[PDB]
Amino acid sequence: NLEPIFQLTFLGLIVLAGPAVVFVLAFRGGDL
Amino acid sequence: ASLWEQFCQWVTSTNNRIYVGWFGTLMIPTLLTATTCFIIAFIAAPPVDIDGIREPVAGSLLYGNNIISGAVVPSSNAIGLHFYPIWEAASLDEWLYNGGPYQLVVFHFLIGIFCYMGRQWELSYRLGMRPWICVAYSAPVSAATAVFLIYPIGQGSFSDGMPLGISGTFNFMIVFQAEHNILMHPFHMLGVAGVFGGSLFSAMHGSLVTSSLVRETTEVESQNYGYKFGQEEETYNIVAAHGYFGRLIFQYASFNNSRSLHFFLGAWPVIGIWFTAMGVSTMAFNLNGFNFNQSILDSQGRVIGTWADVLNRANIGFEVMHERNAHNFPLDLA
Amino acid sequence: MLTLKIAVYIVVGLFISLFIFGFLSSDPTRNPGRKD
Amino acid sequence: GGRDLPSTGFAWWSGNARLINLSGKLLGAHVAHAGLIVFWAGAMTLFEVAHFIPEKPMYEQGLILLPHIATLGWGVGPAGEVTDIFPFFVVGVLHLISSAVLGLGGIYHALRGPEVLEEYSSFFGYDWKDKNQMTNIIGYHLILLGCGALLLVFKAMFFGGVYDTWAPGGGDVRVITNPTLNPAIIFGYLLKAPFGGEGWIISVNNMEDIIGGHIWIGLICISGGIWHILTKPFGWARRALIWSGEAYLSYSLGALSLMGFIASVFVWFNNTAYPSEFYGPTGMEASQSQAFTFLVRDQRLGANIASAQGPTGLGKYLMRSPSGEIIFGGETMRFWDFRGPWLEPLRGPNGLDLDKLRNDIQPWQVRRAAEYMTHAPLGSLNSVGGVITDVNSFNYVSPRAWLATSHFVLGFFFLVGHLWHAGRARAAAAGFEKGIDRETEPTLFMPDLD
Amino acid sequence: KLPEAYQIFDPLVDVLPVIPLFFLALAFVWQAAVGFK
Amino acid sequence: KSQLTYDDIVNTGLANVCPEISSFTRGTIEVEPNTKYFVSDFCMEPQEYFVKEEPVNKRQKAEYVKGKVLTRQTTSLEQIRGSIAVGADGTLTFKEKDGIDFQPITVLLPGGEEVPFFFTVKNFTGTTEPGFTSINSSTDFVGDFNVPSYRGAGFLDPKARGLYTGYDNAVALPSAADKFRTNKKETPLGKGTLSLQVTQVDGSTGEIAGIFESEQPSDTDLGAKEPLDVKVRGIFYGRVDTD
Amino acid sequence: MESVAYILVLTMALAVLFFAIAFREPPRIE
Amino acid sequence: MQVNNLGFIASILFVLVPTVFLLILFIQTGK
Amino acid sequence: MQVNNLGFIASILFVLVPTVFLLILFIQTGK
Amino acid sequence: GLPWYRVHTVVLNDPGRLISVHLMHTALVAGWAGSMALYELAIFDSSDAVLNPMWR
Amino acid sequence: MDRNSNPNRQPVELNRTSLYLGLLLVAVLGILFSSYFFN
Ligand code: CLA
Ligand code: CLA
Ligand code: CLA
Ligand code: CLA
Ligand code: CLA
Ligand SMILES: CC1=C(/C=C/C(C)=C/C=C/C(C)=C/C=C/C=C(C)/C=C/C=C(C)/C=C/C2=C(C)CCCC2(C)C)C(C)(C)CCC1
Ligand SMILES: CC1=C(/C=C/C(C)=C/C=C/C(C)=C/C=C/C=C(C)/C=C/C=C(C)/C=C/C2=C(C)CCCC2(C)C)C(C)(C)CCC1
Numbered sequence A: 001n002l003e004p005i006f007q008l009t010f011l012g013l014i015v016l017a018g019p020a021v022v023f024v025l026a027f028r029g030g031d032l
Numbered sequence B: 001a002s003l004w005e006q007f008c009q010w011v012t013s014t015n016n017r018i019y020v021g022w023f024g025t026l027m028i029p030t031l032l033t034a035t036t037c038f039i040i041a042f043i044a045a046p047p048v049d050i051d052g053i054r055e056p057v058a059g060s061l062l063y064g065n066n067i068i069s070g071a072v073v074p075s076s077n078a079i080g081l082h083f084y085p086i087w088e089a090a091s092l093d094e095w096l097y098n099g100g101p102y103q104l105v106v107f108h109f110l111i112g113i114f115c116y117m118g119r120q121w122e123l124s125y126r127l128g129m130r131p132w133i134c135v136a137y138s139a140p141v142s143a144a145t146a147v148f149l150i151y152p153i154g155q156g157s158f159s160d161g162m163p164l165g166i167s168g169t170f171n172f173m174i175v176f177q178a179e180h181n182i183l184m185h186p187f188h189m190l191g192v193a194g195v196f197g198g199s200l201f202s203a204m205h206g207s208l209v210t211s212s213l214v215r216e217t218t219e220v221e222s223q224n225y226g227y228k229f230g231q232e233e234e235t236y237n238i239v240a241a242h243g244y245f246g247r248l249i250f251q252y253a254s255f256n257n258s259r260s261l262h263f264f265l266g267a268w269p270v271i272g273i274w275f276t277a278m279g280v281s282t283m284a285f286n287l288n289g290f291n292f293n294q295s296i297l298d299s300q301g302r303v304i305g306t307w308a309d310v311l312n313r314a315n316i317g318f319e320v321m322h323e324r325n326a327h328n329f330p331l332d333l334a
Numbered sequence C: 001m002l003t004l005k006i007a008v009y010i011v012v013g014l015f016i017s018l019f020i021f022g023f024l025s026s027d028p029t030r031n032p033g034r035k036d
Numbered sequence D: 001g002g003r004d005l006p007s008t009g010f011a012w013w014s015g016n017a018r019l020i021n022l023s024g025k026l027l028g029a030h031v032a033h034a035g036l037i038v039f040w041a042g043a044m045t046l047f048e049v050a051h052f053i054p055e056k057p058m059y060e061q062g063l064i065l066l067p068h069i070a071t072l073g074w075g076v077g078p079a080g081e082v083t084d085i086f087p088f089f090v091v092g093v094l095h096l097i098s099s100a101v102l103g104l105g106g107i108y109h110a111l112r113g114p115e116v117l118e119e120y121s122s123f124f125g126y127d128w129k130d131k132n133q134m135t136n137i138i139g140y141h142l143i144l145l146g147c148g149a150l151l152l153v154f155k156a157m158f159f160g161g162v163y164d165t166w167a168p169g170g171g172d173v174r175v176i177t178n179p180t181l182n183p184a185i186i187f188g189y190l191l192k193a194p195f196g197g198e199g200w201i202i203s204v205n206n207m208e209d210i211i212g213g214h215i216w217i218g219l220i221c222i223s224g225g226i227w228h229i230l231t232k233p234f235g236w237a238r239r240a241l242i243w244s245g246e247a248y249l250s251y252s253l254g255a256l257s258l259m260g261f262i263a264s265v266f267v268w269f270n271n272t273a274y275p276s277e278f279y280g281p282t283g284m285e286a287s288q289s290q291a292f293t294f295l296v297r298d299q300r301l302g303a304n305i306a307s308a309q310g311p312t313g314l315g316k317y318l319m320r321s322p323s324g325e326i327i328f329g330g331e332t333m334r335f336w337d338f339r340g341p342w343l344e345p346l347r348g349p350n351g352l353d354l355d356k357l358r359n360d361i362q363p364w365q366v367r368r369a370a371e372y373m374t375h376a377p378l379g380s381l382n383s384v385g386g387v388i389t390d391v392n393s394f395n396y397v398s399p400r401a402w403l404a405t406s407h408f409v410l411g412f413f414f415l416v417g418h419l420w421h422a423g424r425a426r427a428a429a430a431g432f433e434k435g436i437d438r439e440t441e442p443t444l445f446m447p448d449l450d
Numbered sequence E: 001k002l003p004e005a006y007q008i009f010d011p012l013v014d015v016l017p018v019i020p021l022f023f024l025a026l027a028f029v030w031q032a033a034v035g036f037k
Numbered sequence F: 001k002s003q004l005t006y007d008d009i010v011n012t013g014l015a016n017v018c019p020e021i022s023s024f025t026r027g028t029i030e031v032e033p034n035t036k037y038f039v040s041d042f043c044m045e046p047q048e049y050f051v052k053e054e055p056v057n058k059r060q061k062a063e064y065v066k067g068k069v070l071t072r073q074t075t076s077l078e079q080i081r082g083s084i085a086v087g088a089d090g091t092l093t094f095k096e097k098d099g100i101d102f103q104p105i106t107v108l109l110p111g112g113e114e115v116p117f118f119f120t121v122k123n124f125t126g127t128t129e130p131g132f133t134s135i136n137s138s139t140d141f142v143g144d145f146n147v148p149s150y151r152g153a154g155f156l157d158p159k160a161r162g163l164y165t166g167y168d169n170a171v172a173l174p175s176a177a178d179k180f181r182t183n184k185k186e187t188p189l190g191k192g193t194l195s196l197q198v199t200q201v202d203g204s205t206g207e208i209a210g211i212f213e214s215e216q217p218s219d220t221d222l223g224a225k226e227p228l229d230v231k232v233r234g235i236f237y238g239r240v241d242t243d
Numbered sequence G: 001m002e003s004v005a006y007i008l009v010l011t012m013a014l015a016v017l018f019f020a021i022a023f024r025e026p027p028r029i030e
Numbered sequence H, I: 001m002q003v004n005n006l007g008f009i010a011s012i013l014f015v016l017v018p019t020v021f022l023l024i025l026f027i028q029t030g031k
Numbered sequence J: 001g002l003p004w005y006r007v008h009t010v011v012l013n014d015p016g017r018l019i020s021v022h023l024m025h026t027a028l029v030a031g032w033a034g035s036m037a038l039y040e041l042a043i044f045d046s047s048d049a050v051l052n053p054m055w056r
Numbered sequence K: 001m002d003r004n005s006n007p008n009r010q011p012v013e014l015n016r017t018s019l020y021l022g023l024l025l026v027a028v029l030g031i032l033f034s035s036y037f038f039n
């Protein structure tokens, strides 16, 4: 089916969201 | 000044050969009570109807036990979790027959060990130490509380508390495995790691320190006389011990900071024991070890055995024989 | 039994009262460091 | 406030200790964590709703939040059958959205808001030594907790009532009209022995007592809130206690450990605030049910269960408790204190009544006993139900087991945390939390022990 | 289950509750990016 | 008893007490010459236990010795149903039918010997003398009752020897396994004699109360040892259905 | 009579404890 | 109980022989 | 021969206890 | 040094230690009484005071 | 109260000849009494 596929897409977007925030702050020079 | 202040100064005095303290004012009476009753009961208590089926079990030396087989027998299954002090028995003989000594000893012992842990904190405070030896002590206390209080509570009877005896301990363990598969419980696995690793690290640390002792003696006298009580100079060469160990495994796996090393020595067994205490405490609520019985099926659907199935066979063998007269109905729920 | 019950109750109450009133008796000041 | 070891004295693994004196940053951390809590509530509720088969009992489906909502009287009717799935969904949604708001506020305070609040406002600024301000915050929060208790009371009285498993005609959502304000009962609950047959407050067995105790709790909490707003700690309290942020944390940790232990016991034993309709049988209930199931079966087969002696000479099906009551035989003798709505119609003044056992047992009671016996809170860590020697085909672990185990573990580790922080708070107040000062090592001025 | 209008995002509700685990992980990620100062 | 609830009774011991009628009670229950009347909730509360100690000398009086109960308030028969049939001459015949008509009881004797026994009224048939046209203070039902083995045939001894289950030998000693007399379990059916002296009759409510004395054997532990003689003295209550 | 032997060894152990505590070698700083 | 007939003497000697060894060594120490 | 069952232990202790007393005293002499 | 048969003369002029050794002797004698009674109790046959009295 | 060294303490001695004499005495007493101990 597609339930694991959709589930994994949501999970991966979530997994990236946090590290993406940290990486953007580190690269653009925001306070950390 | 006042009589009360003088008493306070006495109880909290760091000059007493044995520190008393406020926690000590509870520890000492309860621990002495538990000890006196334990000695008397282990030597001379009459048999106890542990299973509540009028099948008394002889625990004391005078009734034919040796030291290995002797025990203070847990109170009757008929009592369950009811409070059974001496004054609730019509006679001392009745109290003994139903296992009252077990309850007396256990309750006083548990109060005493919690007060012992409080007393450790108290004395460290009086001596200006850091306060966390009692935290390390909370691991054995947690395990003791699990086996004497929490498990009987979850199971609904002090009859299911660990007996106060050697063979009784083994019986407790075997039945616990039969009913909960503690070996296949990860918290017990962590406890095993805790104790195996604690012994490993004890041996390792002791051996590295002993290996790196600074020469201060001759080959005739004990090297122990090389250390004088109250010296600041270090009695061993930690840098040589680090050189050895970092070459035994590799450099970055060896501690060179004694403080971090000793923190690790404290933390490893303590955490392992906390985890195994929590394992026993949660199997008290029958959240058991892993069950992989018939996990592997062949393509047709026949079960292929694994070592878990062999273990389950052993567990069933233990289970069907335990408390052979106590069960009336097909499922061992209680 | 009732004599035993009363006696044990008295003993336990006295020990608990000792412990409580001791820890109420300005215990934080009974240390070798600071007294504020 | 610094954000590294040289300027704070705390390593990264103790980095939150750096917040002890940054009141605004600490408020941000607290609000963000509250957001995490509310988020989990909402997300877990939505997950459970999504994974809910509304005609299969809740306890068979790994649900711990939906039973809480059902017990409150939302979405359930007689025998606990799920009428409307939408209230569960609304509770979950509301928590999720407010969690978003709480997280935003916590992030603002932790990351951009003022570092400390004391030079911005006297009302929200606090100092741990400010005994008056600390008791003010206790007072505000005591008022709020009293409001929450009265919210439960209002739901039970005027907003549809709560689920009463003891309801005549069958357990059902009913409106509590006569809560017991009688202080004798309410506060004698607190005086009952924490042992078998008494069950200190775990034994509360009727929604009237629960609601009346909550009315009392609301009044006590609100009056204590006002008391602490308008007063400062007395001399005895000032002399006995440590007055510092870590000390207050340690006190709360002790409190939390106590509450966690109590909740684990509560869910393990109590079937009133935790109806077996939603949480499944207690272990005691399941054992009693097995005894009842086989009494009924053997009686239908022709066994004279009154006079049948078992192998040991005690009655197979019936026996006496040590106080004389007529109880189920077998190992379940330990569980004779059990009371449940399916078993009490057969209990007489002396315990189990032979006449009711012989001609009053209903088919629904037989069905309930079978269900409860087969959902005994026994199970493996990988969720294989039954006794541990059973095989893999029954995927069940009681919600009571999950809740009791988790809360016992959390209670213990919070006792450990209390010990850690109480010891540290004492040592820091006395000024030796960083080690023994070599110059003034206290033991060196102490006489030798012998 | 979820009421009918919402079962397009069933696979998102399936993963929502584990998010606080990721926050706990993110604390360590942030500390790793700052070199665990 | 009285008129309270299980909540008032629980953990008091009252559940083990046989109900009592009254004080101003000297009634009588008239009985038809040849009809049988059901007895509804017959209760027997033991109070005194004596064990006939066995002297080693010979030929000498054994002297029943008072024992003390180690089991708790678990010693009473109750909810017993039976019947009373009135003979052709006038005799009264009490017949126990069922109920909670047995309790295992263990008494301690001076000297530390523990005596379990199966205190019961099972299948008790008792009779009065002829010429009874009523149940009154002179009604003495003297009769017999059966005493099943204390341990059932499903019991396993500590070496898992039993009658219809378990080993028939001492497996822990393979070369002496068949050497032990206790390898053979028995459950003989013993005999007891009971007497129910009616002392107080409330004929309106049908309640009779009185004293009882019973004589029976003790546990033999599956025939391991010889049965002692246990005498039990106590009180009894019941309701006689007149209609 | 083996009970006497068990009691003897247990008493010996406890007596050793009491002396090791009460009559210990003082730790001395020098 | 029918115990091993050498039990008491074995136990007594097992304890007594090392006890007296230690006692001798301790008492003569400092000579 | 059916001898007194305490004979061996009594004989052993009767000899051993004073033997060890003398041995202790002798060995520590000069301390 | 002292011959063996004279060791106890060390408390001859030490009233405190003379009291001490008298106390220890009294403790030993009282402990013997207690333990002897306990032993006799552990083996006493009380059933037949006629043909098996205590002095038998 | 203080713990003061007791000045009444004296060494005890058993010379080698005394050792041999005592050991012989003990051995011959054992020889004598063992037969009666066994009976
Ligand atoms: C306990 C939680 C808490 C506490 C103590 C504070 C405290 C503070 N906040 Mg903050 N905040 C929070 C949560 C909290 N906040 C949350 C969850 C958000 C996201 C919406 C914010 C977003 C926020 C912003 C953007 C700002 C603050 C500011 C402030 C400071 C000024 C307060 C003020 O005078 O405004 C006035 C107070 C009022 C007008 C009272 C209104 C009360 C609320 C909003 C109405 C609802 C009341 C409710 C019924 C009570 C119970 C709540 C219920 C959920 C149980 C102050 C120290 C300001 C600041 O730092 O100044 C420099 C500021 O810039 N906060
Ligand atoms: C979370 C809520 C909360 C918190 C943190 C506090 C905190 C405090 N209160 Mg309190 N209080 C509250 C709610 C709260 N209160 C409510 C709702 C009321 C209304 C009834 C009160 C009414 C009140 C009064 C009248 C007083 C306080 C006082 C105090 C201060 C010292 C009291 C103390 O030492 O504690 C611990 C208690 C003791 C050290 C006394 C010993 C108590 C017994 C011996 C403990 C035994 C408990 C037992 C083991 C547990 C079993 C459970 C149950 C069976 C009892 C302290 C800062 C005192 C103060 O400083 O006044 C301003 C004070 O006199 N409060
Ligand atoms: C409300 C509860 C509470 C609060 C507010 C605090 C707050 C604090 N604690 Mg504390 N503590 C608590 C409970 C609490 N603690 C409990 C219950 C324990 C017993 C275990 C402790 C034991 C403790 C110790 C030993 C120390 C503190 C310290 C501190 C200070 C810094 C800690 C820090 O930076 O965290 C940083 C966070 C981490 C390093 C991550 C820890 C991860 C844990 C170990 C595992 C998480 C397991 C969890 C169940 C999830 C499982 C994951 C699974 C999926 C694999 C801080 C003020 C420090 C201190 O004393 O400061 C002065 C310190 O040394 N605490
Ligand atoms: C009180 C807390 C609690 C309880 C009682 C439950 C109970 C349950 N959950 Mg749940 N959950 C929780 C919190 C809880 N959860 C949290 C915080 C999350 C967010 C991650 C979730 C997300 C979640 C999902 C997605 C699912 C569940 C499911 C379930 C059910 C199956 C349980 C299972 O097999 O897990 C397995 C057991 C383990 C994996 C063992 C966990 C052991 C931890 C690591 C113990 C930590 C030890 C200690 C605290 C370490 C710190 C100490 C330190 C000092 C060293 C069950 C009723 C399942 C279900 O059936 O849904 C309907 C399901 O699919 N939960
Ligand atoms: C109250 C009774 C009593 C007391 C207090 C004393 C006290 C003393 N006697 Mg003396 N004595 C007594 C009765 C007593 N005696 C009797 C009844 C006899 C005749 C047998 C003697 C004959 C005697 C002699 C010849 C000498 C003494 C000496 C001494 C002094 C040193 C003792 C010593 O160190 O030996 C230590 C003894 C040992 C190290 C081992 C002795 C082992 C014995 C033989 C067996 C022990 C068996 C058992 C433990 C004792 C139970 C017996 C009990 C029921 C009485 C001391 C002041 C000596 C002296 O005068 O010093 C200057 C000395 O030479 N006594
Ligand atoms: C500060 C800090 C931190 C913390 C943080 C936190 C703690 C947080 C949080 C937060 C939060 C707490 C959040 C949140 C959120 C939420 C959201 C964002 C939401 C939403 C929504 C939605 C979108 C929904 C939707 C839906 C609906 C409507 C219903 C149906 C289903 C669904 C799901 C679809 C850390 C540690 C990192 C570190 C650094 C510092
Ligand atoms: C709702 C409810 C109810 C009710 C309840 C109530 C009413 C309650 C309460 C309660 C309370 C009212 C409580 C309490 C508590 C207390 C505590 C918990 C305490 C304490 C203590 C402490 C902690 C102290 C300490 C100390 C000491 C000891 C001394 C020194 C100082 C110090 C401080 C350290 C009922 C059951 C009916 C039903 C159910 C529901």
Ligand SMILES: CCCCCCCCCCCCO[C@@H]1O[C@H](CO)[C@@H](O[C@H]2O[C@H](CO)[C@@H](O)[C@H](O)[C@H]2O)[C@H](O)[C@H]1O
Pocket (backbone or CB within 6 Å): E031, E032, E033, E034, E035, E036
């Ligand atoms: C497959 C290959 C192996 C995979 C390896 C995965 C594990 C690797 C280590 C995980 C990362 C640890 O992260 C490591 O933390 C240390 C703390 O000592 C920090 O160390 C670094 O900090 C900062 C980076 O901002 C630098 O200025 C500094 O000079 C450097 O020491 C870094 O944050 C990173 O180097």
Ligand code: OEX
Pocket (backbone or CB within 6 Å): B051, B077, B155, B159, B160, B175, B179, B322, B323, B326, B327, B332, B333, B334, D331
């Ligand atoms: O008691 Mn001792 O162990 Ca706990 O599981 Mn049910 O009960 Mn009895 O049978 Mn298996």
Ligand SMILES: [Ca+2]
Pocket (backbone or CB within 6 Å): D050, E010, E011, E014
């Ligand atoms: Ca889904």
Ligand SMILES: [Cl-]
Pocket (backbone or CB within 6 Å): B171, B175, B321, B322, B323, B324
């Ligand atoms: Cl067993």
Ligand SMILES: [Cl-]
Pocket (backbone or CB within 6 Å): B326, B327, B328, B329, D329, D330, D331, D332
């Ligand atoms: Cl059973």
